[PDB]
Amino acid sequence: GWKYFKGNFYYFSLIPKTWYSAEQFCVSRNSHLTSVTSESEQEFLYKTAGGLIYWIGLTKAGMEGDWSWVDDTPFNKVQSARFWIPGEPNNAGNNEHCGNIKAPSLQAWNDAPCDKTFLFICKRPYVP
Ligand SMILES: OC[C@H]1O[C@H](O)[C@@H](O)[C@@H](O)[C@@H]1O
Ligand SMILES: [Ca+2]
Protein backbone atom coordinates (compact mmCIF):
# COMPACT_ATOMS: atom_id res chain seq x y z
CA GLY A 1 0.00 0.00 0.00
CA TRP A 2 3.04 2.29 -0.04
CA LYS A 3 2.99 5.16 -2.54
CA TYR A 4 6.13 6.18 -4.42
CA PHE A 5 7.29 9.79 -4.83
CA LYS A 6 10.79 11.08 -5.65
CA GLY A 7 12.96 8.41 -4.07
CA ASN A 8 10.68 7.73 -1.09
CA PHE A 9 7.78 5.42 -0.27
CA TYR A 10 4.85 6.78 1.74
CA TYR A 11 2.28 4.97 3.86
CA PHE A 12 -1.04 6.70 4.51
CA SER A 13 -2.48 4.87 7.48
CA LEU A 14 -6.00 3.48 7.65
CA ILE A 15 -6.13 3.47 11.46
CA PRO A 16 -5.59 6.50 13.70
CA LYS A 17 -2.98 6.67 16.46
CA THR A 18 -1.42 9.20 18.82
CA TRP A 19 1.63 10.92 17.38
CA TYR A 20 4.10 8.68 19.22
CA SER A 21 2.24 5.40 18.66
CA ALA A 22 2.17 6.37 15.00
CA GLU A 23 5.92 7.07 14.94
CA GLN A 24 6.49 3.71 16.61
CA PHE A 25 4.40 2.01 13.97
CA CYS A 26 6.49 3.74 11.28
CA VAL A 27 9.73 2.72 12.97
CA SER A 28 8.47 -0.88 13.08
CA ARG A 29 8.16 -0.71 9.30
CA ASN A 30 11.65 0.73 8.89
CA SER A 31 10.36 4.28 8.38
CA HIS A 32 9.50 7.52 10.19
CA LEU A 33 6.61 9.93 10.26
CA THR A 34 7.18 12.01 7.14
CA SER A 35 9.32 15.09 6.85
CA VAL A 36 8.42 17.73 4.24
CA THR A 37 11.24 19.58 2.51
CA SER A 38 9.83 20.92 -0.74
CA GLU A 39 6.77 22.49 -2.27
CA SER A 40 6.34 19.41 -4.46
CA GLU A 41 6.41 17.08 -1.43
CA GLN A 42 3.93 19.23 0.48
CA GLU A 43 1.72 19.17 -2.60
CA PHE A 44 2.03 15.39 -3.01
CA LEU A 45 1.12 14.88 0.65
CA TYR A 46 -1.89 17.19 0.94
CA LYS A 47 -3.40 16.04 -2.36
CA THR A 48 -3.02 12.42 -1.35
CA ALA A 49 -4.49 13.17 2.10
CA GLY A 50 -7.71 14.18 0.34
CA GLY A 51 -8.88 16.64 2.99
CA LEU A 52 -8.33 14.34 5.99
CA ILE A 53 -5.95 15.08 8.85
CA TYR A 54 -2.71 13.08 9.11
CA TRP A 55 0.11 13.21 11.63
CA ILE A 56 3.46 14.07 10.06
CA GLY A 57 6.94 14.06 11.61
CA LEU A 58 6.69 17.55 13.09
CA THR A 59 7.53 17.71 16.80
CA LYS A 60 9.16 20.11 19.28
CA ALA A 61 12.83 19.82 20.34
CA GLY A 62 15.22 21.72 22.64
CA MET A 63 14.42 24.04 25.55
CA GLU A 64 13.23 26.70 23.13
CA GLY A 65 10.56 24.37 21.78
CA ASP A 66 11.78 24.76 18.21
CA TRP A 67 10.07 22.59 15.65
CA SER A 68 11.98 19.57 14.36
CA TRP A 69 11.58 16.51 12.17
CA VAL A 70 11.51 13.10 13.86
CA ASP A 71 13.49 11.64 10.94
CA ASP A 72 16.30 14.09 11.81
CA THR A 73 16.02 16.20 8.67
CA PRO A 74 17.19 19.62 9.91
CA PHE A 75 14.16 21.90 10.29
CA ASN A 76 14.40 25.02 8.11
CA LYS A 77 12.32 27.77 9.71
CA VAL A 78 12.62 30.13 6.75
CA GLN A 79 11.81 27.60 4.04
CA SER A 80 8.96 26.08 6.09
CA ALA A 81 7.18 29.34 6.85
CA ARG A 82 4.95 28.95 3.79
CA PHE A 83 3.68 25.51 4.88
CA TRP A 84 1.72 26.42 8.02
CA ILE A 85 -1.99 27.26 8.09
CA PRO A 86 -2.28 31.00 8.75
CA GLY A 87 -2.25 31.44 12.53
CA GLU A 88 -0.27 28.28 13.22
CA PRO A 89 1.63 27.13 15.07
CA ASN A 90 -0.58 28.81 17.65
CA ASN A 91 0.14 26.40 20.46
CA ALA A 92 -3.52 26.12 21.49
CA GLY A 93 -4.02 25.47 25.19
CA ASN A 94 -0.23 25.48 25.56
CA ASN A 95 -0.18 21.76 24.72
CA GLU A 96 0.41 21.40 21.00
CA HIS A 97 3.86 19.91 20.60
CA CYS A 98 3.30 17.79 17.46
CA GLY A 99 2.24 18.70 13.92
CA ASN A 100 -0.16 17.39 11.28
CA ILE A 101 -1.25 18.04 7.71
CA LYS A 102 -4.75 19.50 8.01
CA ALA A 103 -5.73 21.87 5.18
CA PRO A 104 -5.67 20.83 1.53
CA SER A 105 -3.42 23.73 0.60
CA LEU A 106 0.30 24.47 0.53
CA GLN A 107 -0.56 26.24 3.76
CA ALA A 108 -1.44 22.93 5.40
CA TRP A 109 0.18 22.36 8.79
CA ASN A 110 -1.33 22.64 12.25
CA ASP A 111 0.14 22.02 15.68
CA ALA A 112 -2.09 19.78 17.79
CA PRO A 113 -1.78 17.85 21.04
CA CYS A 114 0.50 14.83 20.67
CA ASP A 115 -1.98 12.61 22.49
CA LYS A 116 -4.81 13.16 19.99
CA THR A 117 -5.41 10.31 17.54
CA PHE A 118 -5.23 10.89 13.78
CA LEU A 119 -4.36 8.91 10.69
CA PHE A 120 -0.64 9.27 10.00
CA ILE A 121 1.91 9.22 7.16
CA CYS A 122 5.13 7.17 7.17
CA LYS A 123 8.07 7.88 4.86
CA ARG A 124 10.60 5.22 3.89
CA PRO A 125 13.64 5.82 1.66
CA TYR A 126 14.02 3.69 -1.45
CA VAL A 127 17.57 2.37 -1.61
CA PRO A 128 18.47 0.76 -4.97
O1 LIG B 1 -8.70 27.59 15.70
C1 LIG B 1 -7.60 26.80 15.32
C2 LIG B 1 -7.40 25.69 16.34
O2 LIG B 1 -8.44 24.75 16.20
C3 LIG B 1 -8.42 23.76 17.21
O3 LIG B 1 -8.49 24.39 18.47
C4 LIG B 1 -7.13 22.94 17.12
O4 LIG B 1 -7.12 22.19 15.93
C5 LIG B 1 -5.92 23.86 17.16
O5 LIG B 1 -4.75 23.14 16.83
C6 LIG B 1 -6.06 24.99 16.16
O6 LIG B 1 -4.98 25.88 16.34
CA1 LIG C 1 -2.77 24.68 16.51
Author numbering: 198 to 325
Paper text:
Langerhans cells are characterized by the presence of langerin (CD207), a C-type lectin that can act as a pathogen receptor by binding to surface glycoconjugates of microorganisms. Langerin has an extracellular region that contains (1) a C-type carbohydrate-recognition domain (CRD) that binds sugars and (2) a neck region that mediates the formation of trimers. As in other C-type lectins, the CRD of langerin contains a conserved Ca2+ binding site that binds to carbohydrates. Here we report the identification of additional glycan ligands for langerin through screening of a microarray of bacterial lipopolysaccharides and high-resolution crystal structures of the langerin CRD bound to carbohydrates representing a spectrum of ligands.
Electron density for both sugars in the disaccharide is seen in two copies of the CRD, whereas only a single-mannose residue is observed in the other two. The disaccharide adopts the preferred conformation seen in other crystal structures. Unlike in the Man4 and Man5 structures, two orientations for the mannose bound in the Ca2+ site are observed, each at approximately 50% occupancy, in each of the four crystallographically independent copies of the Man2–CRD complex. One orientation is the same as that observed for the terminal mannose residue in the Man4 and Man5 structures, in which the 3-OH group coordinates Ca2+ and forms hydrogen bonds with Glu293 and Asn307, the 4-OH group coordinates Ca2+ and forms hydrogen bonds with Glu285 and Asn287, and the 2-OH group forms a hydrogen bond with Lys299. When the full disaccharide is visible in this orientation, the residue at the nonreducing end is in the primary binding site, and the 4-C of the mannose residue at the reducing end packs against Ala289. In the second orientation, the sugar ring is rotated about an axis perpendicular to the C3–C4 bond, so that the partners of the 3-OH and 4-OH groups are reversed, and the oxygen attached to the anomeric carbon forms a hydrogen bond with Lys299. In this orientation, when the disaccharide is visible, the reducing end residue is the one ligated to Ca2+, and the second residue does not contact the protein. In the first conformation, the chain can be readily extended from the reducing end. At the other end of the disaccharide, glycans in which the 6 position of the mannose bound at the Ca2+ site is on the reducing side of an α1–6-linked sugar can also be accommodated, since the 6-OH group of this mannose points away from the protein surface. In the alternative conformation, the 6 position of the nonreducing mannose is away from the protein surface, allowing elongation from this end, and an α1–3 linkage of the Ca2+-ligated mannose to GalNAc, as in polysaccharide 44, could also be accommodated.
